[PDB]
Amino acid sequence: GMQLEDLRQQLQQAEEALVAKQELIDKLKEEAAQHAIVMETVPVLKAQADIYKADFQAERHAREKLVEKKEYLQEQLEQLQREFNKLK
Amino acid sequence: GMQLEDLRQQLQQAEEALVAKQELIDKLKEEAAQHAIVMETVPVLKAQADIYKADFQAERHAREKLVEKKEYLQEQLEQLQREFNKLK
Amino acid sequence: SMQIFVKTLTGKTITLEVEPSDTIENVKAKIQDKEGIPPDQQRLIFAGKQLEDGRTLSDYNIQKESTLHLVLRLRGGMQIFVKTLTGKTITLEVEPSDTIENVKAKIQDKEGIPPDQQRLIFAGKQLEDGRTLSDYNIQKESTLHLVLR
Amino acid sequence: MQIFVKTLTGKTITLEVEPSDTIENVKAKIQDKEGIPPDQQRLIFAGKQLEDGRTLSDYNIQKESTLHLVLRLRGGMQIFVKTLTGKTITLEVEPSDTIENVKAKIQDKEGIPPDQQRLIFAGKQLEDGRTLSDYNIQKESTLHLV
């Protein structure tokens, strides 16, 4: 008898639970997509490190080559400074 | 008589639907928490761009410092010559 | 005849009108055309990956309203130097097609001196705002002289 | 307490400390454990770079705290060894490094066995037992290799 009111009360309650858990889902998606787009910043931030490392390396090389030349030019001011004093 | 059965097929359908809704909730949560771990590392990556850049600038000014000396000696080495090429 | 977004890590989005057939290098050109950033100082990234100047947009699966990331190099390509009348020597980042205005601007970005107060010299000859670097055959690692106008 | 320290690529080491400790002491404790020079280390907590002067208390860092470590591309002091050909290589150093360590570093980059290296810094033949600072070797100083 009362059966077709006892299964009408659980249905309301379940229909309501389903709406809620579909609303939490909807919140969780909006959130995920915001994440995905900040997440997209990590491959790039890692890439930024590498290219920065590289840029520094070109600069060190370039510095060295100016140390090579300053040393070579002083090295060839060795094979001359020996003469100038050794002979008068 | 079909009024009984349209409720419990509608109740059973909705309780089934609660199961899938939950699965999708749990997955979407563990995913947001994993993504969270990765997001905790971007403050460091950011700092690393700053460290690298600063390290690069140190190489630059050092580079400049030696370009500076090099320009001075080669300017004086044309001062030492002028009289060396007259007293001989 | 699509269009795309270009975004640095420092914020600031810009839009470019592009073609699926355009090359990555073609874009850099555009990214320079409006942003004033030399192609040799930009590294573009789509789908986690640095994009090669060689290939096209099409190649990399890039449809309308795609966001391309752009990292800025600290150091690009060709550097020259500028010695102040005190010995203070600085370096600039340039290209052969850079104008003297487009050089006086960077002087100021470091020294803080308005371009109208700057007299640049390259071995005895005064440089002119209108002409370009290549016009005065200034090559890499070459040094310039800054005296006040 | 026992805080944690880890790099952006594996290696979480562990380090027994007390809160009154400065950052410089920590960076030194990492040198003994990791063999990394202090001035090459850059440490991070709560998104911020910590400074030698301030202590662990000052930074509100307690036990099991994970400290983020980024390596510099260079320490502060570096020198050059002019190889027998004139090829000048650059080296990263502290005024505490013994000449042996300096050779080891040259062996690393160059592959010259240490027993076959001879190092002179503007006259004065340098020995394995001494430190760069002993010979009053500055940053930007250049050594010659025989």
Swiss-Prot record, chains A, B:
Gene name linked to the record: Ikbkg
TM segment ranges: none
Record lineage: Eukaryota, Metazoa, Chordata, Craniata, Vertebrata
Record PTM text: Polyubiquitinated on Lys-29 via 'Lys-63'-linked ubiquitin; the ubiquitination is mediated downstream of NOD2 and RIPK2 and probably plays a role in signaling by facilitating interactions with ubiquitin domain-containing proteins and activates the NF-kappa-B pathway. Polyubiquitinated on Lys-29 and Lys-53 through 'Lys-63'-linked ubiquitin; the ubiquitination is mediated by BCL10, MALT1 and TRAF6 and probably plays a role in signaling by facilitating interactions with ubiquitin domain-containing proteins and activates the NF-kappa-B pathway. Neddylated by TRIM40, resulting in stabilization of NFKBIA and down-regulation of NF-kappa-B activity.
Effect of residue 65 to R: Slight decrease in TRAF6-induced polyubiquitination. Important decrease in TRAF6-induced polyubiquitination
The protein's name: NF-kappa-B essential modulator
Outcome (variant: residue 60 to A): Abolishes linear polyubiquitin-binding, no effect on 'Lys-63'-linked polyubiquitin-binding and impairs NF-kappa-B activation
Domain notes: The leucine-zipper domain and the CCHC NOA-type zinc-fingers constitute the UBAN region and are essential for polyubiquitin binding and for the activation of IRF3.
Effect recorded for residue 52 to A: Abolishes linear polyubiquitin-binding, impairs 'Lys-63'-linked polyubiquitin-binding and impairs NF-kappa-B activation
